[PDB]
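>> Question from a student workshop board

For tomorrow's exercise we were told to take the sequence and the ligand below, predict the bound structure, and bring the output to class. My setup keeps failing. Could a helper post the expected result so I can at least see what it should look like? The ligand is magnesium ion.
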Amino acid sequence: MTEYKLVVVGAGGVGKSALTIQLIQNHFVDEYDPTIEDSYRKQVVIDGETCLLDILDTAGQEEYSAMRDQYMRTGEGFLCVFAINNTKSFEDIHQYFEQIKRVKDSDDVPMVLVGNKCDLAARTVESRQAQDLARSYGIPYIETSAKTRQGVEDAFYTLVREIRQH
Ligand SMILES: Nc1nc2c(ncn2[C@@H]2O[C@H](COP(=O)(O)OP(=O)(O)NP(=O)(O)O)[C@@H](O)[C@H]2O)c(=O)[nH]1
Ligand SMILES: [Ca+2]
Ligand SMILES: [Mg+2]
Ligand SMILES: [Mg+2]
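>> Workshop helper replied:
Here is what the output should look like for this input. Compare the format with yours to find the bug.
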């Protein structure tokens, strides 16, 4: 079956793992559990087609630079996550965009900008700010909550559709 190599990137703590675990394992549990590198392979049906989602869940940790270069090189589409209550994480996300472009020598890589934790009240990043940034890379902006599952399938399936019709 067709395989989609998805990579979830972003600053530490923004909810990369929570989003992936919500998608694959249908749940959220609030816990501290930083990631090194975790792979999830799940066979799903998206718009009538059987496909294999090969999702690499990456570390926010800035020390794994070499590891970041290799998974950007081999990844097909990128979920670029920040948290809407963490301005720094949003400032950092454009750095991820530029690294993806440099390593893949393309400004045509399928990507989705994900503003996560949209269930929390203390929002510090306005949606308009994130839409602007997304527009300037030609990519969609989708807000998510790994806790309530809001937007989660939207974000991941939109990325698959961005690949599908590249
Ligand atoms: N309210 C709320 N909390 C969330 C959400 N997503 C994640 N969290 C919480 O925020 C923390 C960070 O989540 P986590 O998924 O581990 O982030 P990460 O980006 O994978 N971290 P790392 O880069 O270290 O692997 C955890 O306490 C988690 O429960 C969300 O959508 N809403
Ligand atoms: Ca559930
Ligand atoms: Mg993680
Ligand atoms: Mg290059």
